[PDB]
Design a protein around this ligand. Structure first.
Ligand SMILES: *[B]([O])([O])[C]([C][C]([C])[C])[N]C(=O)[C]([C]C1=[C][C]=[C][C]=[C]1)[N]C(=O)C1=[C]N=[C][C]=N1
Ligand SMILES: *[B]([O])([O])[C]([C][C]([C])[C])[N]C(=O)[C]([C]C1=[C][C]=[C][C]=[C]1)[N]C(=O)C1=[C]N=[C][C]=N1
Lengths: 587, 133, 133, 128
């Protein structure tokens, strides 16, 4: 089917572009119902939890704001007292009560939890390190303690012994994050626990109450008694960061509550409006135009017309750049121009590629016809993932049902790439059985490819090229192709469909647009076309064309400019090539 | 049941049956129950919060459901890709050489999915080709 | 086959094969075994830029065609028998010139190379004089 | 411009005049000297000196700790609001170790890429 401009247009219409936006801040976790309801649970039950999601989603900022709203009984005062001259324990009293007893002791009782004797003989023996130690205290459980320690080393988590030249005693022990979070929340990054090597000591803290202040390699020290831990831990990290953790049965035992962020949200007016109040609450001066352009860039980031990218930190970083280009005002233009400047700043490799194509150092056709040749489309391995055409050739000779992937044989194609070729073979052999086994050796090559390639998305291009080579069918060179194929000759969805279309457009435009160029792609990918403005204009202008297909033969009819049947069609020319090849094959 | 009470739960007959039957399902056997008492307790801890402190049939079926919801993002993605036709699956009609086989996803909690499987036959010399292999 | 050529080198040979098989179909499959060797090569070699030289040598061997030895060749080939751009085109031309000159210049030596590489010829003065002469 | 990105060079040092130490024995590193301006480091040095993660912690969290020695006790040093623009310098390849880390593109949003060649024009001959 042809895709009109109207079918391709996906952008949000802007009314009153310059008008200032005025909207209230959305709650923490908007759009993220799953992770909010897991965290509410973990808060309601005292469970420890882990917040999982890709980088730059804003997971720490949402967590800290959500934690600020909570309220608990004011935390007990927190101290180390001596049970001896070489021994300490961690103690909780009721709150405010150790400013007393600092001096009640200082008469150097009530306070009934502060039991251990154990002081009580410096006159019994004249024997010439005893005052209790205040680690923390606070006036309310609102907000509750909230300690985010990004750098999870043993001293940071557990505290430290200093030695004033050597001895040491109760009062030289400094608290770590675990002490400060008692009666509240301690937040650590899963990557840091693994990287600092502190995962096992941390388990021992949670499973066994062992919290040891760090000592030095020199002379002697203090037994430190294990205390009952009073805190909720939230770990933060990516789906991948938790994988080191999750091989350990102790992890799922300790962190029962998973709070998983979605990488995308529904693209709805409610989330556009949330985004708008979130930006204003961040300090931007935002206009309706700037807001729409940012929301539509988030949809394009997601490669889905129906979803927006949920990564708030990326959206902000781009609005930061737009805001400089708008002189401080976040406008439609400033956002489209911040977008363009990002592409320019990464465009050297394309500028080289385009120039090599213009000089004929890379050989590409974007017009005329040729047999057994097709522009397939690839995406460059390094970010930001530019797409390019890659010339693909098929040649057919008489031989014994061999489909030869030259790239795969030379070690340049991956396993998925190889799988696509096997699957094409499966289709060909089974679709063309009149002669027994196929009377042809086909070879397929990506003509100027010097690197490893992977993926199934050139299956459609490969199969049309092979059919063309069998049937001697000239194919349009002005249309590039992407699409996977299954064994039944059905065309399947592929990735990076915006970059592929756009990169063919860019090659067509640097060579001079003929008026008939375009791209044939999976019907299955309509909801992923969120094409840049320059391509949509070119399609609207009649100067670029997008075709979506469901079957491999539909693509071949378009490229050969003929029908498969209606018979002077293509299927009879394929069968005649095959009969010709079957006769050559018996002298 | 007595082990849970001795752990401190306030337990009802319904909550107890639902926990015992979740232990059988954990074991994947109608005739056996999973012996892992620490897992059974961890789930009753969550149920107990949902029951406001009371361990009931509903609180246990609902603690179960909430665990599945909290791990269901990958399925929610998969289902949506299937609905959009980005993943091509048939669940009706007929076709030759096509079948829905069933696989279990590698990462916990081990969700199952259909996986479309195709076979094609051509004239040739007793070769069975596993493309994936 | 002896482990001295790289993957890109191998790819060029596969691509030549593709060209030959498909270009000469009257007998069915090609009635010849061709072998190609870089005669005094003791090290690993890589690159596609000898594809043209390989394919001319193979065609010569098929047809018993005497080839000029006074002209060296560089160029890649695609499956359609088109010659493609190669790297280091100054060093290649110049190094043949240097071998021709140490052996005594006959007056007819030179190099055949891709039309696609005209904009990369920035040849040293001694070669440009020899061409002018 | 600090070409040699070691922890003492970036973050400063504690000296101990025999032991104690105090405010006035703390020496500044490059990060202190660049406040209100530009700090330039080579991407290869951050990787080679092992100082990439401490450097992120400096930029992401304001933790700048003067280097201490393996002996006896020391000072808590409070994190400050960092005030400086960092430019890293390196080859397309040197940034590849860096770029596997999502924190890198988060912190270094502006890529400034040199072309390996220019147009051969009279204007560039004259510039040369
Ligand atoms: B398609 O999307 O499956 C397509 C198939 C065809 C070109 C062989 N694949 C690609 O576009 C892949 C995507 C990809 C990018 C990065 C890593 C893995 C896969 N690109 C390439 O294979 C590729 C590799 N190197 C350079 C350029 N392109
Ligand atoms: B069956 O249970 O043997 C089935 C066979 C069929 C799908 C090939 N296998 C699977 O369901 C396996 C189970 C399995 C899970 C984890 C590790 C090993 C085996 N699943 C998969 O192979 C699998 C692997 N990756 C993604 C999805 N599924």
């Amino acid at each position: 089917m042809r895709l009109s401009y109207e079918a391709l247009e996906w952008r949000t219409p802007i009314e009153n572009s310059t008008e200032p936006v005025s909207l209230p801040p959305p709650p923490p976790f908007f759009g993220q119902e799953r992770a909010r309801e897991a965290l509410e649970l973990a808060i309601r039950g005292g469970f420890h939890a882990y917040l999982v999601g890709p980088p730059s989603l804003g997971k720490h900022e949402a967590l800290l704001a959500y934690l600020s709203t909570q309220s608990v009984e004011t935390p007990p005062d927190l101290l180390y007292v001596p049970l001896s001259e070489r021994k300490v324990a961690v103690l909780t009293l009721p709150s405010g009560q150790e400013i007393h007893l600092a001096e009640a002791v200082e008469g150097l009782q009530r306070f009934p939890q502060a039991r251990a004797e154990a002081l009580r003989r410096y006159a019994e023996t004249g024997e010439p390190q005893w005052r209790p130690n205040l680690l923390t205290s606070s006036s309310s459980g609102t907000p509750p303690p909230i300690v985010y320690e990004p750098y999870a080393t043993a001293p940071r988590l557990f505290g430290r012994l200093d030695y004033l030249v050597w001895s040491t005693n109760v009062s030289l022990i400094r608290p770590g994050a675990v002490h400060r979070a008692q009666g509240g929340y301690l937040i650590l990054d899963a990557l840091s626990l693994k990287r600092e090597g502190t995962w096992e000591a941390f388990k021992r803290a949670l499973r066994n109450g062992q919290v040891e202040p760090v000592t030095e390699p020199a002379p002697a020290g203090l037994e430190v008694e294990p205390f009952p831990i009073q805190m909720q831990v939230i770990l933060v990290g990516t789906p991948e960061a938790f994988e080191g953790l999750e091989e350990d049965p102790a992890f799922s035992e300790l962190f029962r509550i998973r709070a998983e962020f979605s990488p995308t949200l529904p693209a709805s007016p409610e989330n556009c409006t949330a985004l708008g109040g979130w930006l204003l609450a961040q300090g931007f001066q935002l206009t309706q135009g700037g807001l729409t352009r940012l929301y539509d860039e988030a949809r394009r980031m997601a490669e889905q017309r129906d979803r927006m990218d949920a990564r708030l930190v990326e959206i902000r970083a781009l609005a930061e750049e737009a805001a400089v280009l708008g002189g401080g005002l976040l406008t439609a233009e400033s956002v489209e121009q911040a977008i363009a400047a990002r592409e320019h700043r990464s465009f050297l490799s394309e500028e080289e590629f385009l120039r090599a194509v213009q000089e004929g150092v890379i050989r590409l056709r974007t017009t005329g016809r040729a047999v057994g040749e097709v522009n397939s489309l690839v995406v460059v391995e390094a970010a930001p993932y530019w797409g390019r055409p890659a010339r693909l050739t098929a040649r057919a000779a008489p031989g014994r049902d061999h489909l030869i992937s030259i790239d795969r044989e030379a070690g340049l194609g991956g396993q998925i790439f190889h799988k696509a070729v096997l699957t094409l073979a499966g289709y060909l052999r089974s679709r063309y059985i009149e002669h027994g086994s196929l009377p042809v050796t086909i070879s397929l090559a990506f003509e100027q490819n010097y690197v490893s390639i992977e993926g199934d998305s050139a299956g459609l291009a490969e199969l049309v090229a092979a059919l063309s080579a069998i049937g001697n069918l000239p194919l349009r060179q002005d249309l590039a192709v992407t699409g996977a194929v299954d064994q039944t000759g059905k065309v399947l969805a592929v990735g990076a469909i915006n970059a592929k279309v756009e990169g063919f457009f860019r090659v067509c435009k640097a060579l001079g647009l003929s008026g008939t160029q375009g791209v044939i792609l999976p019907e299955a990918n309509l909801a992923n076309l969120t094409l840049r403005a320059e391509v949509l204009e070119a399609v609207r202008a009649g100067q670029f064309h997008i075709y979506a297909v469901e079957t491999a033969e539909q693509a071949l009819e378009i490229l050969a400019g003929a029908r498969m049947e209606g018979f002077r069609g293509l299927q009879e020319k394929i069968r005649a090539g095959l009969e010709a090849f079957a006769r050559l094959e018996e002298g």
